[PDB]
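User: For a teaching handout, I'd like to show students what a predicted protein-ligand complex looks like in token form. I'll give you the sequence and the SMILES for PLX. Please answer with just the structure.
Assistant: Understood, here is the input followed by the structure.
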Amino acid sequence: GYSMFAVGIGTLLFGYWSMMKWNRERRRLQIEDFEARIALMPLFQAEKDRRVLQMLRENLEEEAIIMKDVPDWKVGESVFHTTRWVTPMMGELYGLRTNEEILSATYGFIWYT
Amino acid sequence: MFMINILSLIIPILLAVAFLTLVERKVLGYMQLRKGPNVVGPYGLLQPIADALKLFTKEPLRPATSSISMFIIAPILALSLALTMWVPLPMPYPLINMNLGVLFMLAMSSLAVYSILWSGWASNSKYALIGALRAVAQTISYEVTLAIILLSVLLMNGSYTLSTLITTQEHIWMIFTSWPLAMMWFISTLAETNRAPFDLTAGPFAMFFMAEYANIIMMNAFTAILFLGASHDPHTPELYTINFVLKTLALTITFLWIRASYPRFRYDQLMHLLWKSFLPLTLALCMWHISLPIMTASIPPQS
Amino acid sequence: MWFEILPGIAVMAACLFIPGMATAHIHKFTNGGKEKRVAHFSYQWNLMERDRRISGVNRYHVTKGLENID
Amino acid sequence: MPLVYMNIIMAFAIALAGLLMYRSHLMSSLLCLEGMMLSLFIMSTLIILNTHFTLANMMPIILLVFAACEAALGLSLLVMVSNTYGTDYVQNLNLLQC
Amino acid sequence: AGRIASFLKNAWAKEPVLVASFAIGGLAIILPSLSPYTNYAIRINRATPYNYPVPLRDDGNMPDVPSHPQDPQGPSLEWLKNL
Amino acid sequence: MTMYIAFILSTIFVIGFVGFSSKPSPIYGGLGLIVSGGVGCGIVLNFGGSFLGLMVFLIYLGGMLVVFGYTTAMATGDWVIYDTGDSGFFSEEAMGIAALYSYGTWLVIVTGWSLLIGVVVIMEITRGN
Amino acid sequence: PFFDVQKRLGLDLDRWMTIQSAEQPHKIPGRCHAFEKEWIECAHGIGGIRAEKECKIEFDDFVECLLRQKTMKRLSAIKRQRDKLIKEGKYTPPPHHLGKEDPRP
Amino acid sequence: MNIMLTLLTNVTLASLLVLIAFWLPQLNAYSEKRLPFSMKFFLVAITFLLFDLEIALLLPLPWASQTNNLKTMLTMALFLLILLAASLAYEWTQKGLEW
Amino acid sequence: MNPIIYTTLIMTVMSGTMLVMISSHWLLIWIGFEMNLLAMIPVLMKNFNPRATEAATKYFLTQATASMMLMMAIIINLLYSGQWTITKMFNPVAMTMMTMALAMKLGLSPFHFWVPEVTQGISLQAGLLLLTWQKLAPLSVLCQISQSINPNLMLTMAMLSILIGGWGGLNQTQLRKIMAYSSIAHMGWMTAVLPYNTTMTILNLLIYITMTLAMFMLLIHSSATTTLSLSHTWNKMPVITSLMMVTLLSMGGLPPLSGFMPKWMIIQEMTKNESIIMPTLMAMTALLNLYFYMRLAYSSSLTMFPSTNNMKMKWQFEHTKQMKLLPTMIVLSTLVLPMTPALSSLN
Amino acid sequence: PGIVELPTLEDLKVQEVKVSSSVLKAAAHHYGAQCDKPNKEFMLCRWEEKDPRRCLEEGKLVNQCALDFFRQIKRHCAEPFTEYWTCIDYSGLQLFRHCRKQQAKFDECVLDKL
Ligand SMILES: CCCCCCCCCCCCCCCCC[C@@H](O)O[C@H](CO[C@H](O)CCCCCCCCCCCCCCC)COP(=O)(O)OCC[N+](C)(C)C
Ligand SMILES: CCCCCCCCCCCCCCCCC[C@@H](O)O[C@H](CO[C@H](O)CCCCCCCCCCCCCCC)COP(=O)(O)OCC[N+](C)(C)C
Ligand SMILES: CCCCCCCC/C=C\CCCCCCCC(=O)OC[C@H](COP(=O)(O)OCCN)OC(=O)CCCCCCC/C=C\CCCCCCCC
Ligand SMILES: CCCCCCCC/C=C\CCCCCCCC(=O)O[C@H](COC(=O)CCCCCCC/C=C/CCCCCCCC)COP(=O)(O)OCCN
């Protein structure tokens, strides 16, 4: 009676201690991974900015080629009153590109399992 | 080669169900001081094939006035859900890797009652409808406590990812951290699949049987992954696969043992069991497992 | 005796061995002999997309090492 | 406002019209309210996810919960009405008149 | 005292599940307010960097702000390591 | 483009709503609503709302359409509006949903009180007498 | 009608959830956060009538960011003209837009 | 794409097997010759539904434990569980769980 | 029911209304409406009979449809501007959805059909609660967004409500249906001044609540729900019939009674906005309400109807339970016209 | 309203770091220790200007500094680094814990060499 309850409580306490140690170790490992990501972030940000700018410039050049016959069109005209930089929308970067990479950029993370 | 992977996941599960029928018959026979099927096949191994051939050849008794659409749809849904719930599981690497794999499994289990409801309604009999209502009430009642126990246990895993459970139990099994929740989970999985002592209830009949035994094996594998964490070495996953399969087999044989050992409950008795013994303890242990990581500064990593 | 039950169980065990192992082997064949890369949280997805772009063969698993730095 | 939003809005409108028809079977009326709330959940989730408004990720679930609670009450009412007549027909609820 | 003891003994018989559930829930409510490791858990949660630490523009009046992570000034995680 | 999978999902959603809005044989209307709920869950999941889609599909379908069916048986342009950046090493949906306890104390209080009152109200209404 | 109990008591019962740019968890930023911040700072204390008549530029930008209707119109015009030219045969897409480019990290 | 294809394969295999089972014995010729509405089942269904609604709120608890506001989150989680227990107790003491 | 449960449900209804009144987030306003609806149903079904169940199910259907419409309006407003604060809507379609939802919740025409039937089905105390406390939250929301409303739609529904109440009250012998049609007409009067002055809306609401409380408590005291049952009260409680006649005269808008205060003020306000025809029609239509109030007064206190012999036994007993605020309600509903300028208190 | 100005394609041309994410993760800690100053300059400029077009030269600087870091790695201890990254690349989650020994060897080599 008392012995069975004591055995149950004792094994519960042993499990609690073991998982305390293991979970603290896991917290430290996660902090290490986050530190690695933080160290790598600036290079990725630079590459991302440069890639976005290249795609925008390519789309602008193609628009300049295409819109030469439209009377009231202005090439590279913003739709916002503000001069502040606006993060480009997904259709602005992949609008004129091929379907496969449009579907990639749109649903690759969602569909990857 | 994803299709080959899907077939290599599906076909072996159905074969395992077919031979689980034979295993259960032989285990019950030897527990009852007799032999099981040992004539059809060298050691009874041809018995499931003979049963399948006989069932698929025998006339199907369509009620001739029942709802044809639902009468066909119910076994389709049963088999589809039973085969789908194996996709989320990691052995060690899952066929499909889901962020919320546990929640997906819970949602599939929640759907599983529609087959019972539709089969009961289609039979065009008051007594069959009453039995179906009993079954649905029991199933939803016990899936309540299944969900609560599941979230209480997962509060130590750190997320709903089923693979992380392997990382959580790298040193010790989750059975030692929480055995009472595991006991209530085992009883609730017995109740959920309508296995004894909670078993109060041609082609399509075999289809339902296959779905039920697939859910039995699936639930036992889920319990093994959840509470008995097998060690995994990334350069040799065969060790994890063998260990996980052995634990799943042991749990299935434990269902057979429980079937062979006990009488069955009444409907009101199992309703009272759940609603007055499991739910209070489940809520109390849910509070305890919410508080414990904060008290002991042992919160799992992922967020 | 009781071991008369063992054959069928063995068969069942084999049927439970096939899925898991199969996935592992496929995950090595379609991912260049390594574990299939898992992508939660969309940062790992970004790493995979960067590797896929810098591979030059449109496969992320092909790893460009220190020999690619010139 | 793209085509998906208009599709969900017209789904809500169809559910509302179906509720306002009342052929019979008050259970169908409850089903129509239920489809209305489902469309509301879908469109609110789409709007909140698209605009990356992190906090209102709460409100779909809450909406569901509250609407679901409402559903429960409605079912109770339906049941009780049947207990008086043996059927949930709409035309039996004509004791009270203008 | 005596009546409470009689009530607890009478409930521990024929109603052990309810007694256990109420005891466990009461412990789950009370114990966190007394444990000294709760602040440790809060600190561990604070030390988890999910975002990039944006540097501050130096203005000649920031002695406690490091210029490099290796510098002694700045928060440390030795308490975490010793845990 | 995969011929606007989101658009065709929304079209199936509208078709299912038309299907059960005619209200034929309330079991058939319930099944049409179940199909519509599954399609809407697919829409939300394909959009990126994994947790909210699974909440639909679990709570909505497996509980309350189930209770509706139980009670009934007892009786007689896309891809464009999307983002450019990433989320970090976490999912924004989970953090925002997760934030209700830290941020949404008032919401938790009112919702819990409402649910308790709902239990009391159901029992009182079904009391009979 | 509206009894502003929160302002009198300083409670903040539900104001944390009213706007995009109000202290999201983990400092996650709303897509239209910059636009909403400008619209709010334009219209603060000015009153509803003057806010509606005088802060129309910021609200128009905020609305545009939220729904992107004008961007959709421009993109559709570009795609439609490109389709007309390719049907006529006097325009050819470059290798970049056919998937034949050299990708960058 | 993977999940949709897996679902389609599962449903296709189930359908193929059920139809072949339903038509294999159809090739060879053979002979080929109420009210009660008990109230307790509706109540158990509604209780399950009410409980289910409570279950959804907690669902986010695994993620709720990383907030730096551990006191507030713990208080609100315990409040939700206590109110669930109070719902169970009220339905217990009012003969709502009887047959 | 249990008094504890009844008190809990009443406080839950009041807390829902309060939640609607004090919140600044549209979700919290919707939650308050949901809480109010959830706790209101058992109050309507406190006394069990088939008629009360029918009234409760009709009320639930109407209010749930209105709540779904209101949430649709909220989500559309969020779509066209990512705002959750209750203020000007910013969307024409959303405002209409919101206006129809609130009109359905209030009972304004053409969404009036549920009010007479629900009021007839439920008891007198439930009707008092339904016709007094259940108008505060929708009217408060309307006041908060009054700068958004299209005046054409609101004024159309107000005039329709006044006409419908006046015409529908003429055909009634049941007292609860008379109260319901009177409430519809008074709601029509209240919503016609929202586009111009919410203070006049609140003043009309307060005066109407006072008169309705007095009339319902008088009807409960002399436990009558029909004209002929009320015609027997003079043979037991003539003073109650006299007070009821004075209250009915006040409810018809006769000076110098209190009921003249709102319409007068409202008319006055509507004249400052160069609106002449509409107040004229409103007063001419209110003459119908006065007609059926006067018919009730004729049948109750101005003439002596035949009685029965058993009434003699009722002469030997007195009321065990009393309303403390009934005299104050009568006085406030009949004799507050001299204190009209106090409306500057922004009541 | 106005014309959005974009840099020319020549302005965006830079000598790119063409190593995979496994190599980057293997080097990340020492990379953050060594190449910190240009990285912080770039990130401070990036959160202050709120404009990619105003931060391009700092991005070129961080690319150059990363290239210099990897050239130093290549020159002194290519083999130790290669073995360490092979381990990181194998794991699907790219966990540091899985190959501690490889990391230790790499750490000793860099300290002696650099
Ligand atoms: C003061 C007036 C008292 C009388 C009137 C009471 C009215 C009804 C009672 C319900 C209202 C209670 C008010 C609580 C509002 C919540 C907000 C406030 O309390 O602060 C919170 C503090 O929360 C605390 O946990 C309060 C706990 C109280 C709730 C537990 C029991 C509540 C029961 C009340 C009624 C419920 C049903 C009936 C139960 C018997 C937030 O904490 P914090 O994290 O710093 O700030 C978040 C912002 N961050 C993220 C930037 C940091
Ligand atoms: C028909 C007679 C009706 C009488 C009404 C009931 C009388 C008993 C009331 C008990 C005392 C009430 C006073 C409340 C104490 C504090 C008041 C405070 O909380 O509210 C202030 C304001 O209190 C009220 O406004 C004053 C109520 C006084 C009502 C009397 C005027 C009625 C018209 C004249 C008829 C004659 C009546 C006099 C004889 C008794 C500030 O309100 P505010 O948060 O800033 O904005 C909300 C209102 N808005 C939206 C319209 C702007
Ligand atoms: C994967 C692991 C599997 C573990 C379980 C293996 C099963 C072994 C074979 C036996 C199972 C056979 C199944 C048959 C169904 C049996 C179910 C059953 O009877 O349980 C009922 C039983 C009692 O009901 P009744 O006797 O009918 O009376 C109640 C009314 N007065 O219910 C229970 O007791 C449930 C309790 C489950 C275990 C929980 C015990 C924990 C109590 C103390 C724990 C303390 C921990 C708290 C934290 C510590 C902090 C200091
Ligand atoms: C502060 C913590 C609170 C949170 C913890 C609780 C979480 C879950 C538990 C509560 C669930 C709801 C409980 C509902 C209570 C109803 C009980 C009841 O009515 O049952 C009575 C009988 O049960 C009772 O006696 C009532 C409760 C008895 C006391 C139970 C424990 C009370 C507290 C004990 C411990 C307190 C703290 C620890 C003290 C011990 C030393 C540490 C009748 O039983 P029947 O099945 O209907 O019929 C049987 C007769 N034929």
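For the handout, you might add this sentence: Chain E touches chain J at residues 52, 54-57, 68-70 (CB under 8 Å).
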